[PDB]
Design a protein that fits this description.
homodimer, TIM Barrel, 4-stranded mixed beta sheet, 16 strands, binds 6-O-phosphono-beta-D-galactopyranose
Chain lengths: 474, 474
């Protein structure tokens, strides 16, 4: 017998400002690092960018009405820092705050709980220009000032907040892989920026305790649970290294305020460890979150990797199946195809049991409630005559992940809610518009902007029924 | 770039009173549960028992002289509770205390550090008769009286103490598998006795802080780190279940004072969870140890197990290779042969890398120092003419584990010491005398005590050389 989903389970869906909003230069909004980066040649799929995106800034009333029609309990969205502080630092842009206030009002007038993400990768370019953004401790005081602004303004109406969305992704992609702004490939700078981002996260959680005493806050981590390829001791050891280096490196800091020792000693042996200042540990250890936010798409299987072995690998940004290649850390671990799971056209593993495994690992290790802040299936969709989008693949993906969440709840994992990625189709940072996640199809592609009209997919109605029965019918 | 062993790394060897001492009814000693159990037909290999064992009680001066020849830094032994309290909880037998006083003085006169195990499975039979020993909360106060008696007598001279040796083994073998006293096969009774043993462990650690404020104390857990068979998600999940039910169930209590929640909920679902009294959680959470004691011999590889699958398996007690069979918990996991490791004649896996993995898991999860209180190879030995025993198989086994310990120290695991099982050959509880672990061969077998003469094996001189070079020369 499964436990039921708890009565006030937050059935949600999610978006991110740069990927949906558009209006990139309207109503006083400043330049963000993604405004600049996406316009650089070769950075994005077919030169796509978020100048217009799906124009949610102008169509939010229509979108929220589709949320209300679906019966969403919660909508997760991010605030565009550059809309609120065009220069990151100076005067507040009241037109910017007014849009999110209008959005929050619309959500609550339809009975939808807002989940606000403070940071979803769009730091104002002025801060990058002024002092290198996340590579400078000044961003701690500046990020704090921006979050306290939002706390003060909306703390009375928003109860659930996410600090940093996938710190491990925007730090790693921006400073090690060079696939995000600032486009750097420097492991030393990566760990310095990562450490500063850790301090920023802790500082705003502390500020949150003053300004929103009745609220709940936490970071959202991009969690790929690691698997060993097999029972060979050297591959299990590679799995130990991979979980500590890819996952504990962040989640131990979030939950305990401490970096894991084996990864630290390994970085220190190379001069790659971050610069710690007095007070850093006191701050990191005095900032307990209310939950661990988890963005989950797939697990990763690993095996042993020689000191001269695999480093950077090819990532599939085209939807042409089978084109990604193994990546790893020489000497520590390398990824390997898991022969027991299917994969998407972008080579992502489909592993819903992996989600239960991951929820169990976090509960068992940190004893924290979990808010699943992202999960979903990115695939091609076909619009059919009669406004029909038959996305059975997406229904079956979500169905199996929701089923494993109920098992994890039965196993004792305190899951506060589930936010599917995404409510409407939106711009994928590196994959363009063809890689669709929405319950609501948006009428545009990578060649033509068309009319951006919204069309309900088969999965919209499936998820509507899930919410109505509180998950009893999947 | 390996780190050296620390300057005062405790290079040790170990024994246990019932396996080594003999003199089972001399100098006022009372009956233990093992004196009674091993004399029951069918309970032990060929009816062997520890009436004489290897007569360490009379020959301790010879044995310590051999330890000094070897250059042992530390000797781990257990105190026979029935020597000190013949009826478990009445008047003290001073002759019993005098033996351990002579032993400790003999060790310290040769510069060897005593490591005292309070409990190595031999609770006096009078407590079993009076109230069922570990199934009664009365044992908490009776074990405390015994522990404080030793703390006050020897605390000036012994700084390293172990509370319960392998609680997971003597509780599960005595109350679930029926292979140790009291021979019970009842899962509910097992978890009750286990919870009482947790309370007794916490209580003596609390007392220790008062009576030996400068000492170090910890439990010694029988740790078999679990592996998934492959990357099939269902087998990784079986691995999560196995590591939680077999390892976290004890080590989380030792380190954090809490049972893991998924295992608790599963037991609670069948009414097998232990009876928790008010005050229990407070006691368990207020008894932090100085180290995790780790008894390591092998890893275990697991795969999924259907609800009608494998339960109890066959254990090898004869030294005939390939006679063990799979065991598991239906619905959760079953053990499976790991094709990547060798096995002994008793079907124990040989996995030195698994020790590194196990050390890393404890350090990463609990941030505790580790004292390896047991590790060694049980095998047939042949005495050759001229009193020669060439146990190159044992040297190879020990060498590879000591190498993996050094790599774990380099990873940042704080390892305090290493006690090889065992200093001399001794009685294996269920395997008789032919399953030998010693650096020192004892001339006897299952059929004759012979002259009990001590004979240094090749591994004796190998370890002497390890200690002399502080592990630089393996
Ligand atoms: O768009 P992708 O690369 O398919 O990833 C899908 C999603 O998962 C995370 O990485 C991001 O937080 C989202 O913004 C979104 O990008
Ligand atoms: O003697 P065995 O069964 O080979 O195991 C070897 C050792 O196992 C450990 O569990 C016990 O603490 C030791 O007393 C010793 O028995």
């Amino acid at each position: 017998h499964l436990k039921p989903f708890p009565p006030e389970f937050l059935w949600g869906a999610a978006s991110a400002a740069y990927q949906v909003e558009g209006a990139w230069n309207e109503d006083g909004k400043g330049l963000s690092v993604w405004d600049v980066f996406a316009k650089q040649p070769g950075r994005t799929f077919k030169g796509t960018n978020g100048d217009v995106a799906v124009d949610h800034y102008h169509r939010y009333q229509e979108d929220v009405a589709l949320m209300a029609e679906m019966g969403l309990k919660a909508y997760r969205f991010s605030v565009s820092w550059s809309r609120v502080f065009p220069d990151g630092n100076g005067a507040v842009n009241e037109k910017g705050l007014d849009f999110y206030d209008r959005l929050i009002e619309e959500l609550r007038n339809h009975g939808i709980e807002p989940i606000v993400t403070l940071y979803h990768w769009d730091v104002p370019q002025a801060l990058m220009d002024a002092y290198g953004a996340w590579e400078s401790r000044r961003i701690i005081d500046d990020f704090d000032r921006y979050a306290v602004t939002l706390f003060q303004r909306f703390g009375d109406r928003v109860k659930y907040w996410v600090t940093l969305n996938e710190q491990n992704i925007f730090i790693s992609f921006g400073y090690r892989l060079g696939l995000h702004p600032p486009g750097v490939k420097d492991m030393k700078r990566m760990y310095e920026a990562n450490h500063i981002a850790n301090l920023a996260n802790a500082k705003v959680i502390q500020s949150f305790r003053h300004y929103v005493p009745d609220g709940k806050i936490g970071p959202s981590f991009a969690y790929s649970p690691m698997y060993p390829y097999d029972s060979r001791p050297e591959n299990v050891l590679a799995f130990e290294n991979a979980e500590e280096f890819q996952n504990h490196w962040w989640m131990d800091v979030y939950a305990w305020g401490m970096y894991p020792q084996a990864a630290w000693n390994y970085l220190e042996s190379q001069g790659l460890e971050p610069t710690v200042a007095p007070g850093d540990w006191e701050l990191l250890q005095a900032a307990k979150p209310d939950f661990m936010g988890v963005n989950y798409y797939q697990t990763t299987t690993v095996e042993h990797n020689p000191p001269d072995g695999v480093g950077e690998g090819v990532m599939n940004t085209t939807g042409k199946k089978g084109t990604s290649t193994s990546s790893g850390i020489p000497g520590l671990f390398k990824t390997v195809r898991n022969p027991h799971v299917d994969t998407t056209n972008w080579d992502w593993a489909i592993d819903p049991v992996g989600l239960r495994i991951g929820l169990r690992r976090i509960a068992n290790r940190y004893q924290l409630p979990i808010l699943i802040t992202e999960n979903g299936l990115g695939e091609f969709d076909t619009l059919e005559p009669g406004d029909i989008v038959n996305d059975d693949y997406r229904i079956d993906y979500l169905r199996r992940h929701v089923q494993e969440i109920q098992r994890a709840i039965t196993d004792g994992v305190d899951v506060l809610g589930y936010c599917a990625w995404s409510f409407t189709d939106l711009l994928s940072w590196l994959n363009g518009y063809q890689k669709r996640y929405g319950f609501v199809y948006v009428n545009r592609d990578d060649e033509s902007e068309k009319d951006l009209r919204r069309i309900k997919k088969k999965s919209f109605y499936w998820y509507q029924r899930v919410i109505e029965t509180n998950g009893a019918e999947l």
